[PDB]
């Protein structure tokens, strides 16, 4: 059976990363911030919070709003996720040295949780007020959930496929998994991949709040997101979007690109357990991590580091601890970045994949914020307090989505 280690798949490397977060618009600054213990989570000051008296009054808006970079035409003729895709795809391409690739070997794979949904409600209101001829001629292309990937594919010139996998909170990781598949199956030599997501707004907060999934520690915003802590009380929104450039090691060498890490293998499984709760036993989630190892050609004993999905729900973190045990990965050093950056839904697995890469590049794991009282059910080596330095070689990034979706990505130091 082919694996990356045995040469049955070609070697695939990560050659550039870009992200915008609640800490910074610059991924390198976000990273320095994380290592210094910074949080992106603050009191929400939006008028919508008081207008509705929302139960949730905390979150991390982007440090640098996407629309501060957008012309007036884009603000009207693109949905928000498309604008985010255009901004991040252009940034990534510049970071990569604007390479001249063969468009016919270049794919784009970008996940998102929903798509241009503000344009659904806009079109509905316009039609209700004015009739069907008031709906924009650009409404379909702004709404369709493949819209952001399609904008990026047209902008950068990708003709080897433009794919949008949707798996709710695992979408951003799933996108990188399918990009890796598209390269190792021989359909592309280079891909832009990752995830984008909309901003914090009143209706998204109402819907998730009514699920009772969210922290309401509004008193102390930076202390609210507590993955694996005994006193955790649910997740916190933190806006983001993230893309990375991956390509065959061959392709990278031929253009002189310096790899940041290796993308070794990807596992996708599902729970068949519940529409929003993850299976308590962690078994299928663990098998996603095992599958990524099998395709990489690694054993769980090789794994140095897990970047946890770690949302800070009581049931979600308990299930993930079980998953990491099922996969034999519970001796590894664990980081839960949502402690600092909060949860960006369809973007978050992509953001956390970029963080995994930077851990491997720099030999360091940031502290998991708010990790103060260990939970006996969890029993994981959670990095906390100070950043932890080490010669990390191999890491798994976990992401799980409502609907029972498990995605694990195996990364290696270059």
Binding residues among 283-302 for a copy of itself as defined by CB under 8 A: 284, 287, 291
Q: Stretches 83-91, 140-148, 251-259, 320-328: which one binds ligand M7U (CB under 6 A)?
A: 140-148
Residue 200 binding: pick among a copy of itself, ligand M7U, Na ion, none (C-beta 5-8 Å cut-off by kind): ligand M7U
C-beta neighbour count of 207 within 10 angstroms:
10
Nearer to ligand M7U, 127 or 364 (CB): 127
- What is the DSSP pairing of strand 190-195 with strand 261-270? unpaired
Q: Stretches 53-61, 131-139, 209-217, 396-404: which one binds K ion (CB under 5 A)?
A: 396-404
Residue 12 binding: pick among ligand M7U, K ion, Na ion, none (C-beta 5-8 Å cut-off by kind): none
Smallest gap from residue 133 Cβ to a copy of itself (A): 7
DSSP 8-class letter at 314: H
Residues from 283 through 312 that contact K ion (CB under 5 A): 307, 309
C-beta neighbour count of 130 within 10 angstroms:
10
Report d(CA 85, CA 91) in Å as an integer. Answer: 10
Nearer to ligand M7U, 43 or 207 (CB): 207
Report d(CA 233, CA 392) in Å as an integer. Answer: 31
Q: Interface with K ion includes 320 (CB under 5 A)?
A: no
Q: Interface with a copy of itself includes 158 (CB under 8 A)?
A: yes
Residue 206: is it exposed, middle or buried by C-beta count within 10 angstroms (0-12/13-18/19+)?
middle
Q: Interface with ligand M7U includes 139 (CB under 6 A)?
A: yes
Residues from 18 through 37 that contact Na ion (CB under 5 A): 37
Give me the residue label for tokens 């399918």.
Answer: 178
Radius of gyration of the chain (CA): 20
Angle subtended at Cα 148 by Cα 9 and Cα 267, rounded to the nearest 5 degrees: 30
DSSP 8-class letter at 278: P
Residues from 217 through 276 that contact a copy of itself (CB under 8 A): 268-276
Smallest gap from residue 25 Cβ to a copy of itself (A): 26
Angle subtended at Cα 368 by Cα 364 and Cα 371, rounded to the nearest 5 degrees: 145
Nearer to ligand M7U, 35 or 139 (CB): 139
Nearer to ligand M7U, 117 or 395 (CB): 117
Nearby residues of 175 by Cβ (< 8 Å), 6 or more positions away: 109, 110, 111, 163, 164, 165, 193, 194, 195, 349, 350
Smallest gap from residue 90 Cβ to K ion (A): 26
Smallest gap from residue 48 Cβ to a copy of itself (A): 10
DSSP 8-class letter at 60: B
In the list 113, 286, 342, 367, the residue contacting a copy of itself (rule: CB under 8 A) is 113
Residue count of the chain: 414
Q: Interface with a copy of itself includes 165 (CB under 8 A)?
A: yes
**357-386 mask for a copy of itself (x: CB under 8 A)?**
------------------------------
Q: Which residues pair with 395 in a beta bridge?
A: 305, 411
Nearer to Na ion, 31 or 400 (CB): 31
Sites of contact with K ion (CB under 5 A) = 307, 309, 352, 397-398
């Amino acid at each position: 059976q082919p694996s990356t280690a045995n040469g049955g798949f070609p070697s695939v490397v990560v050659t550039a990363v870009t992200a915008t977060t609640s800490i910074s618009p610059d991924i390198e600054s976000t990273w320095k911030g994380l290592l210094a213990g910074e949080s992106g989570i603050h009191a929400l000051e939006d008028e919508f919070v008081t207008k509705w008296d929302l139960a949730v009054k905390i979150g991390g808006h982007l440090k640098d709003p996407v629309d501060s970079h957008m012309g007036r035409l884009d603000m009207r003729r693109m949905s928000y996720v498309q604008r985010m895709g255009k901004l991040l795809g252009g940034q990534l391409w510049e970071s990569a040295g604007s390479p001249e690739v063969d468009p016919d070997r270049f794919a784009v794979v970008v996940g998102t949780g929903l798509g241009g949904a503000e344009r659904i409600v806009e079109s509905y209101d316009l039609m209700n007020a004015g009739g069907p001829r008031k709906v924009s001629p650009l409404a379909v292309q702004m709404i369709m959930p493949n819209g952001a990937a399609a904008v990026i594919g047209l902008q950068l010139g990708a003709r080897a496929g433009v794919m949008t996998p949707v798996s709710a909170q695992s979408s951003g990781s799933e996108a990188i998994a399918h990009a890796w598949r598209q390269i190792v199956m021989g359909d592309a030599d280079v891909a832009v991949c990752g995830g984008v997501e909309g901003p914090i707004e009143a209706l998204p907060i109402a819907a998730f709040s009514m699920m009772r999934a969210m922290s309401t520690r509004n008193d102390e915003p930076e202390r609210a997101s507590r993955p694996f802590d005994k006193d955790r009380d649910g997740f916190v929104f933190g806006e983001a979007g993230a893309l990375m450039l991956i390509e065959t090691e061959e392709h990278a060498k031929a253009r002189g690109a310096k790899p940041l890490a290796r993308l070794l293998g990807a596992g996708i499984t599902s729970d068949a357990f519940h529409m929003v709760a993850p299976a308590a036993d962690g078994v299928r989630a663990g098998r996603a991590m095992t599958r990524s190892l099998e395709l990489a050609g690694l054993s769980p004993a090789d794994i140095d580091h897990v970047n946890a999905h770690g949302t800070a729900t009581p049931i979600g973190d308990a299930a993930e601890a079980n998953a990491i045990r099922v996969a034999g990965c519970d001796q590894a050093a664990v980081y839960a970045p949502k402690s600092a950056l909060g949860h960006s839904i369809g973007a978050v697995g992509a953001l956390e994949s970029v963080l995994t890469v930077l851990t491997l590049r720099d030999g360091v794991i940031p502290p998991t914020l708010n990790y103060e009282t260990p939970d006996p059910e969890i029993d994981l080596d959670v990095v906390a307090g100070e950043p932890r330095y080490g010669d990390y070689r191999y890491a798994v990034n976990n992401s799980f989505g409502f609907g029972g979706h498990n995605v694990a990505l195996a990364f290696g130091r270059y």
